[PDB]
């Protein structure tokens, strides 16, 4: 029964969280979380157990030395707080409700903020992997917009761990939806920055986040058109994952906006990268089966890695000018290194169309280049040593006999 649990089991689980073995601490926290979710009634003595016994009791696990304890707390914080709120409702059927709610909100907010700024990155990633948008109810719109989002935007600064940036791009959608549009202007430059990241899976995750936010209607109209104009070049990226994420985002946008908007804005953007005109844009297949060939990886990596990228693009655009009739002739480059590098690239068979695709991708290339440059024990050992001794005995006997 509920009273049996509360009286006899919980005060012993809380004592197992203060144990030496980290695994014992994690298991104690998991069992404590599981047991408390069984309760469906509030005995008179357990009216205010949460804000005075359990939450203060397990507070120390947010700063434990071992990372397993911190991972356990980060995984079980979302469920513990939600059980606290439901617990207060039960007591109501039995201090103003609003003041207690505010106190619980403050506790949850403080603990979330403490977890989001821990030295390790696995703790931070886990906090966002299991209820970062759920605790967004314990913050509020303004507090989330000024505290939760501000702490999540400093993850994109870390230039030595792309897992954390990927996690941010994965989990930003829920927080953006909860905080509303008052945060739209904040996340536009961050989404633009992600699409020019050194690691390409981060670009994939950013494209997925853009698609998701565009489906829910969280993007302004001009921002949608700007992102469509910036992502169209990716339909000819050598990498395949990005070349498909771009298609997904473009199909989603073509579905969201009206027919006139699609025919006025999206199609003019998509004209260079589709071999033939299309009609069923919202259908993914009718878009994939029409795209042109990508830029072969060899030329792409030779052009991106080579230093003095600006001069390379300058001369490439000069050659494009000559090819388009803009200028009567294309003069030779000033720098012999640029000439030699152009010869090397042209020896790989880079086609004029490949030059056009390189130029269209120029903005992504330069920003990516600069960013990249800056970047069970005793018996087991007894058996082992017995095996060692047997092997050594056989060894010595055999060698002496030899």
């Amino acid at each position: 029964s509920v009273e049996i649990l509360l009286d006899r089991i919980t005060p012993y689980l809380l004592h197992f969280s203060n144990d030496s073995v980290p695994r014992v601490r994690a298991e104690a926290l998991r069992t404590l979380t599981k047991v408390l979710a069984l309760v469906k009634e509030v005995p008179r003595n357990d009216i205010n157990i949460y804000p005075e016994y359990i939450l203060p009791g397990i507070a120390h696990l947010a700063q434990d030395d071992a990372t397993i304890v911190r991972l356990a707390y980060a995984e079980n914080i979302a469920l513990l707080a939600e059980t606290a709120l439901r617990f207060l409702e039960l007591v109501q059927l039995k201090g103003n409700y609003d003041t207690e709610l505010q106190a619980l909100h403050e506790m949850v907010q403080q603990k979330v903020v403490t977890l989001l700024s821990d030295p390790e990155n696995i703790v931070k990633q886990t906090l966002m992997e299991n209820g970062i948008t759920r605790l967004c109810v314990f913050f509020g719109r303004q507090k989330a917009n000024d505290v939760l989002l501000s702490h999540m935007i400093t993850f994109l600064n870390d230039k030595n761990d792309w897992h954390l940036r990927g996690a941010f791009f994965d989990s930003i959608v829920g927080v953006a939806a909860y905080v509303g549009w008052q945060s739209s202007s904040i996340l536009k430059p961050l989404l633009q920055q992600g699409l020019s990241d050194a690691e390409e899976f981060v670009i994939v995750k950013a494209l997925y986040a853009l698609t998701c936010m565009c489906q829910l209607g969280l993007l302004q109209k001009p921002h949608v058109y700007e992102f469509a104009s910036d992502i169209a070049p990716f339909l000819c990226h050598p990498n395949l994952w990005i070349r498909y994420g771009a298609v997904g985002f473009i199909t989603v946008v073509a579905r969201q906006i009206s027919t006139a908007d699609v025919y006025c804005k999206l199609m003019p953007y998509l004209d260079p990268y589709i071999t033939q005109p299309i009609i069923q844009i919202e259908r993914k297949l009718v878009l994939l089966s029409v795209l042109k060939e990508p830029v072969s990886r060899s030329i792409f990596d030779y052009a991106l890695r080579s230093k003095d990228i600006t001069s390379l693009f300058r001369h490439l655009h000069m050659r494009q000018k000559k090819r388009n009739g803009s200028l009567p002739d294309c003069p030779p480059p000033e720098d012999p290194a640029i000439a030699q590098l152009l010869k090397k690239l042209l020896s790989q068979g880079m086609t004029e169309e490949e030059e056009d695709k390189l130029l269209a991708l120029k903005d992504f290339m330069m920003k990516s280049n600069k960013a990249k440059a800056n970047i069970t024990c005793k018996t087991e050992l007894q058996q082992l040593i017995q095996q060692k001794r047997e092997q050594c005995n056989a060894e010595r006997i055999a060698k002496q006999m030899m």
């Binding site: 205010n48 990372t67 397993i68 792309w162 498909y244 994939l288 082992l384 055999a398």
Partner: protein
């Protein structure tokens, strides 16, 4: 024989993803006929696909931490990652039956991934020792690496005979001769190559941290640091935790 206990060694367990060596089976024409998405799948592309191998440590059938991906690396003619993944778990936090699942992935369509294999190799092998060297795990096809105990996708099962003997040679337990073993070792290399070639399944190679900051000579071993009165009483003198709980509350 020198060794360091798992409990004392406080660093992050590291694993190297080598090369997925094998042949990948394809479907018939009717499969692509009914589901056109297979044409744009990764497997149906002429060149080797840009697969990425996730990894997650399990224990008692329970996931122990988040999976770890492999940094993007382009492939032209072979699958050669040669990357040193860093695992979220540390040596003192690995239970005895810990086992590392490793799943391969490939594109199937816009915003979808499809497993192209799965392998599961125990970390602490026989005699409670951390597996080292360069182990070539097996690859179960079209099944995500299963972490349940006992595993349904195990990694490692006259080739077996030579596997044991080679170990005894380099642990000092064998007769000493130079030319004979110089030729016999190439013989075993060819035999292993033939055995791998015959097998229909794939085979994902992998290496542990045989060389670390400390001397390579050391090895890791599972370890941890835990008639007046007749009728037993195991809590005769302790704290009344229920009394404390009631006292604190009101």
């Amino acid at each position: 024989f020198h060794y360091i206990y798992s409990c004392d060694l406080d660093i992050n367990v590291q694993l190297k993803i080598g090369s997925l060596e094998g042949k990948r089976e394809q479907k018939s024409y009717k499969a692509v006929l009914e589901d056109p998405m297979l044409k744009f799948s990764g497997l149906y592309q002429e060149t080797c696909s840009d697969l990425y191998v996730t990894c997650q440590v399990f224990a008692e059938g329970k996931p122990l931490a988040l999976p770890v991906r492999t940094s993007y690396k382009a492939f032209s003619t072979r699958w050669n990652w040669n990357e040193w993944l860093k695992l979220p778990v540390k040596y003192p936090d690995l239970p005895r039956n810990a086992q590392v699942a490793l799943t391969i992935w490939d594109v199937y369509g816009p915003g979808k991934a499809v497993p192209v294999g799965g392998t599961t190799v125990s970390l602490f092998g026989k005699y409670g020792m951390f597996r080292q060297g360069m182990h070539d795990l097996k690859v179960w096809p079209n099944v995500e690496a299963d972490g349940s105990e006992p595993t349904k996708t195990p990694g490692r099962t006259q080739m077996s005979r030579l596997a044991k003997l080679t170990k005894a040679h380099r642990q000092g337990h064998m007769v000493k001769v130079d030319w004979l073993d110089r030729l016999t070792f190439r013989e075993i290399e060819m035999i292993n190559e033939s055995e791998k070639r015959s097998s229909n399944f794939m085979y994902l190679m992998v290496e542990f941290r045989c060389v670390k900051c400390d001397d390579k000579e050391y090895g890791i071993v599972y370890y941890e640091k835990d008639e007046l009165v007749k009728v037993p009483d195991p809590q005769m003198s302790m704290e009344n935790l229920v009394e404390s709980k009631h006292h604190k509350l009101a």
